[PDB]
């Protein structure tokens, strides 16, 4: 069987039933619109679903590695990575949602607070003393 998915921009995407069933939102429908999801973003989602741990097994989900194919698949622009994550959240593609978050965490892990703000466009509302105290707290979490 084949189901048709309509993007927010109006483009229709024919997709096998099972490949669409990777979304719990779709598998709970008892032509499907996917609003605020660009046509190019829904294309990447179907591509990921074609190529391919339960909920309440959060420890195994955090232990899960990032497939090498998913790593290069998510090696897109930062805007596309956001919208891929956002679309996986709306459609409840948790396996894709975890993969996208682990990649974002990989861009954050080990980086200075200033470098993360420049990469992700975050404003600093801390005072220089508040950052110094947080830095000491985070040192308590390290191996020494």
């Amino acid at each position: 069987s084949n189901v048709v998915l309509v993007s927010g921009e109006g483009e229709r995407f024919t997709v096998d039933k099972k490949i669409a069933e990777r979304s719990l939102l779709l598998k709970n429908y008892l032509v499907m619109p996917v609003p605020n999801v660009r046509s190019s973003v829904l294309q990447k989602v179907i591509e990921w679903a074609e190529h391919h741990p339960d909920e309440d097994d959060d420890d195994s989900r955090k232990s899960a590695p990032v497939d090498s194919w998913d790593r290069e698949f998510l090696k897109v622009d930062q805007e596309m990575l956001y919208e891929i994550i956002l679309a996986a959240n709306y459609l409840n593609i948790k396996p894709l949602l975890d993969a996208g978050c682990k990649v974002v965490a990989e861009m954050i892990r080990g980086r200075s607070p200033e470098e993360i703000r420049r990469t992700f466009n975050i404003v600093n509302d801390f005072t220089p003393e508040e950052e110094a105290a947080i830095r000491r707290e985070n040192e308590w979490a390290e191996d020494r």
Binding site: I116, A133, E137
Partner: protein
């Protein structure tokens, strides 16, 4: 263009599982969200109406308050708090509601134990005290081992040979059999000079079956410790070998070690935080009063900050592990809290 803040709250909560320490230093939003996260962890573990919060509230606040010289500006990011009291709820208590990340870690691991007789037959009791032990310490030993480290002042390398003759006896207070944690007998031979030495006695053994405490709602147990002088000498009486205390800190997980030396110091406060020990001792004492009608065999001591860079010289356990003094000098202080969860 876009920003990380444009993502939903559930995405932020997932990123906090992978990079909490990096995100909590980004902006006030993630710091407060990180603080709220450990509020949920703590209360889902120990409910707001549980007897633990009732008996540890003040001593726990004094422990967190002693950390203000290092983190007060970070704690005061959350302002809607009041001093602890009978009429101030838990989620509004100062030094707790603004410190859930530190409160949660302070309850998840056994605290240090200081020998209050450090500056005072065939067997003489050098020390007998308590600490609060999470009931599931054994079932989490892989990712979260529980070491037993002993602190000694050694007058010289020759009196160090009496270290194996001081016996460390551990067990649950008024429950179960008591066991002995010890190092190899010849670790003393690795001590070649005067100093304060931290000797690893291994890991905390299996003191009971955790399934016995399933369905009873027990989260902590009073861990009793007793240090016995069986040296058949006057090395402790002459203060040539002084027992400073114990901790359970996994120093340098990446580089296993047998002992390490710090320079002799004027004050035991450079090693032990008195407010932390007071919290752990009182926590364990209150637990022993509530969990057993049997009388505790020793008087209730009254334990009564100062973090400074103290260089440690390790005797490593792997023969291929070489010294790296530059790394040791650059590391953060080790006499600060160890946040592990």
């Amino acid at each position: 263009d876009s920003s990380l803040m444009d993502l939903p709250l559930e995405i932020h909560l997932s990123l906090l599982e992978y990079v909490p320490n990096e995100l909590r230093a980004v902006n006030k939003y993630f710091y407060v969200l990180h603080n709220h996260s450990y509020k949920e962890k703590s209360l889902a573990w120990i409910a707001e109406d549980n007897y633990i919060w009732a008996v540890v509230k003040h001593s726990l606040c004094l422990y967190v308050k002693s950390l203000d010289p290092l983190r007060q500006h970070a704690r005061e990011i959350i302002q809607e708090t009041k001093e602890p009291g009978f009429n101030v709820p838990l989620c509004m208590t100062k030094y707790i509601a603004d410190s859930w990340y530190i409160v949660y870690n302070a309850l998840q691991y056994p605290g240090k134990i200081i020998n209050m007789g450090w500056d005072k037959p065939k067997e003489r009791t050098l020390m007998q005290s308590l600490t609060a032990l999470p009931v599931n310490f054994w079932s989490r030993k892989k990712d979260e081992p529980t070491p037993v480290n002993v602190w000694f002042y050694v007058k010289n390398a020759h009196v160090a040979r009496y270290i194996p003759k001081i016996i460390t006896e551990i067990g649950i207070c008024n429950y179960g059999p008591k066991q002995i944690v010890a190092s190899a007998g010849y670790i003393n031979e690795l001590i070649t000079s005067e100093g304060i030495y931290c000797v690893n006695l291994g890991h905390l053994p299996r003191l009971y079956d955790e399934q016995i405490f399933e369905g009873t709602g027990t989260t902590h147990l009073p861990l009793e410790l007793k240090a016995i002088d069986r040296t058949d000498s006057d090395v402790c009486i002459n203060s040539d070998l002084v027992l400073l205390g114990y901790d359970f800190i996994p120093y340098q997980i990446s580089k296993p070690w047998l002992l390490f030396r710090i320079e002799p110091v004027n004050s035991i406060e450079a090693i032990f935080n008195y407010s932390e020990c007071s919290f752990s001792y009182q926590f364990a004492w209150s637990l022993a009063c509530l969990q057993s009608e049997e009388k505790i065999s020793f008087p209730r001591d009254t334990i009564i900050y100062k973090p400074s860079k103290l260089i440690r010289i390790f005797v490593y356990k792997h023969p291929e592990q070489k010294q790296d003094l530059g790394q040791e000098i650059a590391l953060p202080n080790w006499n600060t809290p160890y946040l592990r969860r």
